[PDB]
Amino acid sequence: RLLERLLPRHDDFARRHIGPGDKDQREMLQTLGLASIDELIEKTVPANIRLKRPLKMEDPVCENEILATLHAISSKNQIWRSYIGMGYYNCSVPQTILRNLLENSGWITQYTPYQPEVSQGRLESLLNYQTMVCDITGLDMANASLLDEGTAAAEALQLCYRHNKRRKFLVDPRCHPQTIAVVQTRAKYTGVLTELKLPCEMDFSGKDVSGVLFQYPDTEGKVEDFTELVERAHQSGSLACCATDLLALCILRPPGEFGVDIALGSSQRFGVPLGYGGPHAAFFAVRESLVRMMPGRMVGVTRDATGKEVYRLALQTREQHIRRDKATSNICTAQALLANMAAMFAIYHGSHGLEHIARRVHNATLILSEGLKRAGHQLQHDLFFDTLKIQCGCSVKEVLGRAAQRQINFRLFEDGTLGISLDETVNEKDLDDLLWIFGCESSAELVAESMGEECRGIPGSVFKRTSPFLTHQVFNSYHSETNIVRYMKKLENKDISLVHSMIPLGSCTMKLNSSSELAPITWKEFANIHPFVPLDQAQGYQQLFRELEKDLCELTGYDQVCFQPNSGAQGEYAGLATIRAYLTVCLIPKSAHGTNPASAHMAGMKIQPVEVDKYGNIAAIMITYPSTNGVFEENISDVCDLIHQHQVYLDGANMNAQVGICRPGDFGSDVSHLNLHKTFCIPHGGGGPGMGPIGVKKHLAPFLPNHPVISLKDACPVGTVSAAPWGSSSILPISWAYIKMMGGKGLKQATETAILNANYMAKRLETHYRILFRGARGYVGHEFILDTRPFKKSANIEAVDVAKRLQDYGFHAPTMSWPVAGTLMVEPTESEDKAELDRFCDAMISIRQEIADIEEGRIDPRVNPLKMSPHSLTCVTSSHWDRPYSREVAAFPLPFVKPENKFWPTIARIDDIYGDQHLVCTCPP
């Protein structure tokens, strides 16, 4: 149009997202000996599996309009005061943690702390989170987060099965309903029988029961003594698992002190938004003797090469990347970032501030309780923390009518009674609205005057907490705003992130997490809605779900998406369970991510491994296209046809090599998870949050996950896989914004440049290191493997030496020893420009020459920069220097590493064995 020539688009976000401009791409193409981008794709991606017609999507939205566009959606939501409860409680998110951690690119762009020596910040903070959970729950050791409350409870069930092998598990029906549904789904496919029984109905006599799950306080609000239940279970060989609340436990005697084996719940009310379901770090802590069976990551204390006390992920042999189908769970990405928010919450308040918040909430509930009783309403339970169950003396409708006038939501119980869960945000004004809602012609002031100040409730009961918590210096040091900012910065600056340098982690897609994408996750219209609100309050979210679904259906070739799964691994489990509901043998290549076999074990499938040939190539199969080695298989249609002849799950984690070029649904796949936090810009967050939505073909849609609280429907659902119906809803705007900004053209170009960048790097490094696997005509997809294994024989150099030595050149290492042990796998993504790629290649080329010096007797084979790496500031600034290379070689190996940009590894090399032999997983004194 002539308008478009006179008045072009204001901006094109693809130009900001994609690093290499025109000049870079031409030069990279010259380096590959190719005339154009299309030629590269034609020589990489098999012709017969490419798209017929280009992605059909909306015209791209300029970056300078994306927030107004999205506001037109989010403003459709209504922000009521929700006192629904059910595991989500509004809280006061300290603005300084929101600003300096959540909206800080130096906290949120890094991923899992695999490389500890450039990750001590987030490792300390996750150690703070564990310490907090252990102190408050009263149990011995806690993990570095699970996905949500209900999954954490399923993991408790699974832990119990792993401990004693018994096929029965008793559930208290007073657990939250979404918790029950997720535990029953896991039990169903793991082969364990669950029974809904109250403590008095629970029969342990038969010595068949693995464990019991109850809640404290329970879903109705009641505080109950489980000492006797726990003792009865113990005398019959069963374990006792307790879902709980960290705020409640600030004044309640905790599960640890009435014999509980496993304590779990959500950390959400410790300073994290409602988020319309997530993301929230769940907690999960166990007795000392159960720790070998712990799920997820767990920070421990160890030594470095100098003997300094330092942090690192401990007992890693439990996890998916080592033990695969024999692992303690399929979980990979958890909710590291939001665990760190909650730990900062507890550091900022201290035990003293958490007691103040908890007492205040409880007294506000006690006050409301007396007001309602005065007015002729009936309270079902005398002792509670923050939650009342009310039989209305007057009409329930007229109450709800008034409640609607003050825009307040209650929990509507099946039996016609009401749930009210007060929280940290509740003040006098709200109590007055609440008392007016129930027709009590008395204010909160006046009700309080005739209560007196004899202690009542929890402080006046035998359930009074007497044990201390958060006595470590870290929880009693950073209470001024000035101090917490300084502390958050100190830990930030220890962690190498995307504000520093490329993090080319294979199968992680460390691409740009844009500001404009990130902004909306802290908008009140997304962050401050309770997941279980009536749907007329969440019509903005509905529209977001539809638009993102439709877009994702179009990129993948599937028919319907389910947002419920809140990690890739959860999507695999969900996808496999949907295949089983539609219908047990699951074929899995040995090249598959460790989540693949673990998910299948969790979904109750018999795993048959399939071998990989020497060129790297190969109820259901799990495939990945491209290969977890970055190579496109020539005849993937044939594999899909073959399985269908006798369903096909396709792992989507490598979709950044596909988008706008080919689609898994077009070539025979029935179901895929997508990693939104890897391909679609959700921030990696130090190891979470992520989302793992599954696209399915028409025929699987009737069996997709449902939810017992908010209904997601010929339906025949597999069950329920996450605590919240659409998982971590509040981070979904990030991927919607990427997609709507990029458009069809931009998304295609991003995939193009991801492949270009990976091949350019491989090309540059091919005469220095072996590129282990390639496609039929020699080209890789979006990543490649450098075979460092030969340097073991020639120089006694291991991949780990190269990993640590890279830190000295200003780079986080690529992915290590997977899919192939003793190798590096490299994924630059599209967001990094030529000069950044050239620095990484030059660092590797220079390291190659260091290996050559050892291979040639030019430098001591025991004491060289590779074996002594990383080189800390304390090492390099010491007066003591007794090494046969200079300090310049150690810390500034090439001229692009300058004092002006020098990132310091904060410690010497990590000792892996020592920490697991001296297991300490709480902040030491």
Ligand X SMILES: *Cc1c(COP(=O)(O)O)cnc(C)c1O
Nearer of residues 615 and 881 to its own copies, judged by Cβ: 881
What residues between 552 and 591 interact with ligand X by CB under 6 A?
567-569
For residues 495-529, one letter each, b for 16 or more C-beta atoms within 10 angstroms of the residue's C-beta and e for the rest, the string is: bbbbebbbbbbbbbbbbbbbebbbbbbbbebbbbb
What residues between 497 and 526 interact with ligand X by CB under 6 A?
507
Least distance from ligand X to the Cβ atom of residue 588, Å:
11
x/- string (CB under 6 A) for ligand X, residues 332-351? xx------------------
825 counts as binding ligand X under rule CB under 6 A: no
Ramachandran sector of residue 22 (left: φ over 0; alpha: ψ -120 to 50; beta: rest):
alpha
DSSP structure string for 227-247: HHHHHHHHHTT-EEEEEE-TT
Residue 205 touches which of ligand X, its own copies, none (CB < 5 to 8 A by kind)? none
Least distance from ligand X to the Cβ atom of residue 448, Å:
48
CB of 412 closer than 8 Å to CB of 393: no
Residue 628 touches which of ligand X, its own copies, none (CB < 5 to 8 A by kind)? ligand X
Least distance from its own copies to the Cβ atom of residue 96, Å:
4
CB of 275 closer than 8 Å to CB of 730: yes
CB of 847 closer than 8 Å to CB of 853: no
Residue 567 touches which of ligand X, its own copies, none (CB < 5 to 8 A by kind)? ligand X
What is the rounded distance in angstroms from the CA atom of residue 251 to the CA atom of residue 463? 9
DSSP structure string for 509-534: ------HHHHGGGG-HHHHT--TTS-
- Exactly one of 74, 675, 759, 788 binds ligand X (CB under 6 A); which one? 675
Nearer of residues 658 and 675 to ligand X, judged by Cβ: 675
What is the rounded distance in angstroms from the CA atom of residue 187 to the CA atom of residue 209? 13
Nearer of residues 112 and 131 to ligand X, judged by Cβ: 112
- Exactly one of 130, 329, 578, 595 binds ligand X (CB under 6 A); which one? 595
Other CB atoms within 10 A of residue 290 CB: 19
Nearest 5 degrees, angle CA 804-CA 808-CA 811?
75
What is the rounded distance in angstroms from the CA atom of residue 463 to the CA atom of residue 440? 30
Helices (H), 609-731: 636-645
321 counts as binding ligand X under rule CB under 6 A: no
- Nearest Cα residue to 669 out of 606, 623, 604: 623
x/- string (CB under 6 A) for ligand X, residues 190-229? ----------------------------------------
Least distance from its own copies to the Cβ atom of residue 883, Å:
11
819 counts as binding ligand X under rule CB under 6 A: no
Nearer of residues 145 and 365 to ligand X, judged by Cβ: 145
Phi and psi angles of residue 163, each rounded to the nearest 5 degrees, phi first: -70, -45
What is the rounded distance in angstroms from the CA atom of residue 857 to the CA atom of residue 160? 56
- Exactly one of 690, 727, 775, 893 binds ligand X (CB under 6 A); which one? 690
- Nearest Cα residue to 587 out of 618, 613, 615, 633: 618
Nearer of residues 484 and 854 to its own copies, judged by Cβ: 484
How many residues belong to the chain? 925
- State the residue for tokens 């967050």: 685
**Cβ neighbours of residue 857 closer than 8 Å, sequence gap 6 or more:** none
Least distance from ligand X to the Cβ atom of residue 729, Å:
17
What residues between 601 and 640 interact with ligand X by CB under 6 A?
624, 628
Residue 846 touches which of its own copies, ligand X, none (CB < 5 to 8 A by kind)? none
Least distance from its own copies to the Cβ atom of residue 807, Å:
14
Nearer of residues 174 and 812 to ligand X, judged by Cβ: 812
Nearer of residues 219 and 335 to ligand X, judged by Cβ: 335
Residue 872 touches which of its own copies, ligand X, none (CB < 5 to 8 A by kind)? its own copies
Least distance from ligand X to the Cβ atom of residue 690, Å:
4
Nearer of residues 595 and 831 to ligand X, judged by Cβ: 595
Phi and psi angles of residue 79, each rounded to the nearest 5 degrees, phi first: -95, 95
Nearer of residues 40 and 331 to ligand X, judged by Cβ: 331
Nearer of residues 210 and 564 to ligand X, judged by Cβ: 564
Q: What are the residues binding ligand X (CB under 6 A)?
A: 332-333, 507, 567-569, 593, 595, 624, 628, 651, 653, 675, 678, 690, 692
